Symmetry: D2
Subunit: 115 residues, 4 copies
Amino acid sequence: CPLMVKVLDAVRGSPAINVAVHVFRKAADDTWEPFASGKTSESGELHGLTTEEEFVEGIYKVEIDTKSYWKALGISPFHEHAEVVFTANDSGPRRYTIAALLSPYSYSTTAVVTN
Amino acid sequence: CPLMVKVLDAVRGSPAINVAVHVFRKAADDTWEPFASGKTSESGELHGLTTEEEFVEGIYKVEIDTKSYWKALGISPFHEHAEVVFTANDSGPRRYTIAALLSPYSYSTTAVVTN
Amino acid sequence: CPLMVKVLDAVRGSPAINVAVHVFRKAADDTWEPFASGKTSESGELHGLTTEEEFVEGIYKVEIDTKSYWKALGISPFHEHAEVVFTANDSGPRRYTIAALLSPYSYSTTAVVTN
Amino acid sequence: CPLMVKVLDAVRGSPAINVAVHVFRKAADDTWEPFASGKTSESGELHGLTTEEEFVEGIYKVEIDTKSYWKALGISPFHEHAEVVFTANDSGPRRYTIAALLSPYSYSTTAVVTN
Ligand SMILES: Cc1cc(-c2nc3ccccc3s2)ccc1N
Ligand SMILES: Cc1cc(-c2nc3ccccc3s2)ccc1N
């Protein structure tokens, strides 16, 4: 509910299906601890990463494994992955959608924060 | 069902709400005839523009009235509107989503074509 | 000099070379009159479209012929072209760079306005 | 010369000036070692980060300090920074331009790779 990831393919004009996504939370020692992960669905979406109880304020990193996605399509890509790093705050809207639009040599990302 | 428009605001990190959208279809005389229109919802989406029966193959133009959107937020914009021009074909997937991500001096658009 | 167009290819990570560009200006009768045209160089850039004297106040449309670009590379893209429509020089003369980043099913455009 | 960074502001339609950029290279022990750093000029560009001799094969991370950029302009943005991670020079030496287009809740990045 509170954190969703959506991935789109700008070459095929389609959801980016079966993309691995890893979420990390910054620890007190300034290391990235694993938090949640999954693979995007047939709709390009990854739901159920976390719960309101566990998604406390902090710095989070969403890593989208774009290189493996392009390699599986036979397309040489530029990036190792796409990383989205942000602070979650409780004074802001409650639902976070991290969206990424992928091309072999480019990506765009935006946050949609609602409620 | 066959044609949906989704608009996002990259300044606020939100759906772009109440954006006027006008759809045109190219006529035989190479003029743009009005086809469908509406305003985006609270989710930034505009549904119900057309039906499968009416959405025949042809060249379509989706005009998103970005200038009025930014002016209503007190932000000086660059573009008069964002225009998305494309051919609809029956050999391709059946549902078209035209997505646009808006900033005052920039926009990005992508097509998600599924089924 | 006062109007430059730069086009990049997000699939190859390269300038988009030999892209046709047509510029129009809205006339008093609300028709798009031809204003200037050209093709991008090896650097993806198109210079020398107009002069300070000729580039008067008005509403301009920069049409970037993306479909022909992709088709020549063996890709059947979504868009017919990318159109950038804006009011120019209404505060006085300015220098405009219209940049476009192209993918088969997506494009992004931004303006850099100086002076 | 072999590595350049260019940053644009999609809110103002201008180069993003005085943006801090830190480059890291992955070491044999899989740690990110500092490689180069600098700030964008009035043109939004950062030149002279490295040399052909020093810019050997490896995995590099270009960290663009977008949060500090927006905060200085009175905007509380979403991202901590924009990170661009890529393998460089594995086919031989190349010239890399990392471009980023910034909005408060979104960024786009592309690579132009030549030679
Ligand atoms: C980064 C980016 C994202 C999008 C989209 N987000 C969403 C989010 C939810 C549903 C459809 C879409 S489509 C569209 C254009 C760009 N550039
Ligand atoms: C990431 C991105 C970058 C650009 C631009 N790169 C350059 C590089 C050199 C000169 C002008 C421009 S403009 C345009 C659109 C997007 N989305």
